[PDB]
Amino acid sequence: GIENIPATLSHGGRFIQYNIFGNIFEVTAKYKPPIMPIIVCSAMNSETNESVAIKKIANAFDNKIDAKRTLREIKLLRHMDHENIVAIRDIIPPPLRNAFNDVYIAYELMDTDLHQIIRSNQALSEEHCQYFLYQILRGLKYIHSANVLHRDLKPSNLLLNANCDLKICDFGLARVTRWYRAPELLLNSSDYTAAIDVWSVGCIFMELMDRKPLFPGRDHVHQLRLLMELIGTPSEEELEFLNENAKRYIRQLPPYPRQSITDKFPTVHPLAIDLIEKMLTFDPRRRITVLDALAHPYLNSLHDISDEPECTIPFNEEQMKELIYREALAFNPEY
């Protein structure tokens, strides 16, 4: 094998099988070697000349919820067109239809993610952190205006470029890390809103500032404890809406004073602090809206309301496989 990663033509030379250590990666021949594994691999489409991240999802038809998780990510990402939301560049058809088991999705290529930035301990300009935050909120606005909640934002779900451009990925869960989950979500009360995403952003930004998770809970209850040890105990009843089952739980808890986030994180910019405090609030209804967060002074330099679009139209069980197949066919007319 010439190519470092072993590559071998398959099915009439219309597909290529790349080895990648015993677990083989089979894609359309338009993606010629080399490919770089980053299971996800970096590849170039020789026709469009564009480069992409190809993700292999193995045995997505085996389970119903895996299948629906997949189908949605596809339909959802295919619905969105936004600079801060990751785009699907290709969906790869199966070499033969009956054996369709593994499903490959090609997204646009990003260099890294916010998790890797944070973990790498590289310093960042204030303007960069600012830009990250702005882009997250900006994409989020669109998502929500499409009547969707991400519901799982974390640093690893935020893809980046050397250009510092940021795109959101890994959708699902909207109309196991608890660290970015909103209070209302730890207490069930299944009714919940866009504010849960806002919470996650606040948690992220602080992590970006302090370089460690803001609420690193070991379990469900430790999470809440750590939440309360910061934001303080909520107004007796006025900051409650939810099921009495959890109300009793919160009342039970010892009083927690609010901690000044400025004093705990003195290094960070005060405007940022202000915004975070508004983003981290026990009550969803007192939690700052995406819109107001974009309009917040900290983001004034980037804030342009005309450049912050909404979704023109909003969004929306085995042979869903056929659906995925149909879209793969949409991306690849030759097959």
Residue numbers in the entry: 32 to 69, 76 to 212, 225 to 365, 375 to 393
Q: What sentences appear in the manuscript?
A:
Mitogen-activated protein kinase (MAPK) cascades, which are composed of MAPK kinase kinase, MAPK kinase and MAPK (called MAPKKK, MAPKK, and MAPK), are highly conserved signalling modules in eukaryotic organisms. MAPKKs are dual-specificity kinases that activate MAPKs by phosphorylating the threonine and tyrosine residues in their conserved TXY motif. Arabidopsis MPK3 and MPK6 were shown to be activated by multiple MKKs, including MKK2, MKK3, MKK4, MKK5, MKK7, and MKK9, and are involved in the regulation of biotic and abiotic stress responses and growth and development processes16171819202122232425. Activated MPK6 phosphorylates a variety of substrates, including enzymes, transcription factors, and cellular structural proteins21262728293031.
Here, we present the crystal structure of the unphosphorylated Arabidopsis MPK6 at 3.0 Å resolution. MPK6Δ1–28, a mutant with the shortest amino acid residue deletion in our experiment (with 1–28 amino acid residues deleted), was shown to be phosphorylated and activated by MKK5DD to a similar level as MPK6. The present model of MPK6 includes amino acid residues 29 to 395. The MPK6 crystals contain two protein chains in the asymmetric unit. The N-lobe (residues 32–147 and 360–394) contains eight β-strands (β1 to β5, β0L0, β1L0, and β2L0) and two α-helices (αC and αL16), whereas the C-lobe (residues 149–359) consists of six α-helices (αD to αI) and three short β-strands (β6-β8). The structure reveals that although MPK6 is topologically similar to the non-plant MAPKs, the structures of the glycine-rich loop, MAPK insert, and L16 loop in MPK6 are saliently different from those of MAPKs. Compared with inactive ERK2 and p38α, the glycine-rich loop in MPK6 folds down onto the ATP binding pocket and is closer to the phosphorylation lip. Compared to ERK2 and p38, the structure of the MPK6 L16 loop does not fit in the groove, due to hindrance from the side chains of Phe364, Phe366, and Phe368 in L16.
